């Protein structure tokens, strides 16, 4: 005669996955902005 609930922990691997690939997409975006700027000068 008894019952029980249950809780959950996230995976360690995940860690700060919010920025694991955010930093990387931000870095690529910076590269793309540099590309865009250089192309703007070249077109001019």
């Amino acid at each position: 005669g008894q019952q029980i609930f249950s809780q959950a922990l996230l995976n360690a691997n995940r860690r700060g996955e919010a920025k694991t690939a955010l930093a990387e997409v931000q870095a690529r975006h910076q590269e793309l902005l540099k590309l865009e700027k250089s192309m703007a000068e070249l077109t001019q």
């Binding site: 019952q3 029980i4 609930f5 249950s6 809780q7 959950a8 922990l9 996230l10």
Partner: protein, 326 residues
């Protein structure tokens, strides 16, 4: 028409920006505003709710006369009641006491000139009748509540600082079902010229992942702390209302779930209401039907000080309720 009351004793003016995009952080002198008002418009007749456009140093403002007091010459004391009715009118004089309040938009940054006038970013405004709340019966509880809770926030800050006290930060309403203990909370939240209330339903805090139930109960106070650090004692009241309090905050020490979340939530609330850091600009309202299950530590003065019981009405209360409903 007036007979004797021909002059303006005290005039209240709400000031607003005509264009929202023209907001300026310039410090406006109320004395200069009054001087300009007298200088440009003298011996004119004005009535409550009358509108005006004012050009001060190139800035255009909308001024609405919220209320007016008419007095007769020779009256040493302004014993006449301040009238919000459009019937009253008066003649402007070089001595009329002009009190400026923020407009409904609340964008104009007024100076406190040297006058120790009541003007502040008021919580309760002026002329507040209990006859407009819309709750019948309970004509003594309202007194007690306003005396104990909101009596100290409509007072010059220097005096309250001298007295060396702190504003209460708790309020509890309990009684049997259907007596009107949620109408009061709604009206208090809506009618007090404060920030938007932060309503929380009873068991809306719990969450699956470990350590996320406690965080949800400390993400409610973050903005209060954010404002209290910057603007000191000039912040606006923040109010958060807990609905069905007794569902989660039971007496810690039993064996309820088999996980141990309720105790952690209770501990977090205990540590955040008083804690080791001062907030002094927050208010929380509670409601419940069973007041014997709330954990004892919550009811100590400093946390949920004022406790009120809402009970069934009397015959006069019934008449008042019938009048209100129909």
């Amino acid at each position: 028409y007036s007979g004797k009351q021909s002059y303006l004793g005290s005039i209240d003016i709400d000031i607003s920006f005509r264009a929202r995009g023209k907001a300026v952080s310039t410090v406006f002198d109320q004395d200069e505003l009054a001087k300009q008002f007298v200088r440009c418009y003298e011996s004119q007749i004005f009535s409550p709710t009358q509108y005006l456009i004012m050009e001060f140093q190139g800035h255009f403002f909308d001024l609405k006369i919220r209320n007016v007091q008419a007095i007769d010459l020779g009256d040493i004391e302004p014993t006449s009641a301040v009238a919000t009715g459009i019937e009253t009118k008066g003649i402007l004089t070089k001595q009329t006491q002009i009190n400026f309040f923020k407009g409904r938009d609340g964008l104009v940054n007024l100076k406190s000139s040297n006058s120790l006038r009541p003007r502040s970013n008021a919580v309760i405004r002026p002329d507040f009748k209990f006859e407009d709340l819309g709750v019948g019966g309970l004509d003594k509880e309202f007194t007690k509540i306003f005396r104990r809770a909101f009596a100290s926030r409509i007072f010059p800050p220097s005096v309250i600082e001298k007295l060396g006290i702190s504003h209460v930060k708790g309020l509890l309403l309990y009684g049997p079902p259907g007596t009107g203990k949620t109408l009061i909370a709604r009206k208090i939240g809506t009618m007090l010229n404060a920030k938007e209330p932060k309503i929380v339903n009873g068991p809306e805090i719990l969450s699956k992942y470990v350590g996320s139930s406690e965080e949800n109960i400390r993400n409610l106070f973050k903005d209060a702390e954010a404002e209290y650090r910057a603007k000191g004692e000039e912040s606006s009241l923040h109010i958060i209302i807990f609905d069905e309090l007794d569902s989660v905050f039971k007496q810690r020490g039993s064996r309820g779930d088999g996980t141990g979340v309720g105790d952690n939530v209770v501990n977090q609330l205990l540590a955040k209401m008083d804690g080791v850091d001062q907030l002094n600009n927050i208010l929380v309202i509670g409601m419940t039907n069973r007041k014997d299950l709330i954990d004892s530590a919550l009811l100590r003065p400093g946390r949920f000080e004022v406790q009120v019981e809402i009970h069934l009405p009397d015959e006069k209360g019934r008449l008042q309720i019938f009048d209100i409903q129909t």
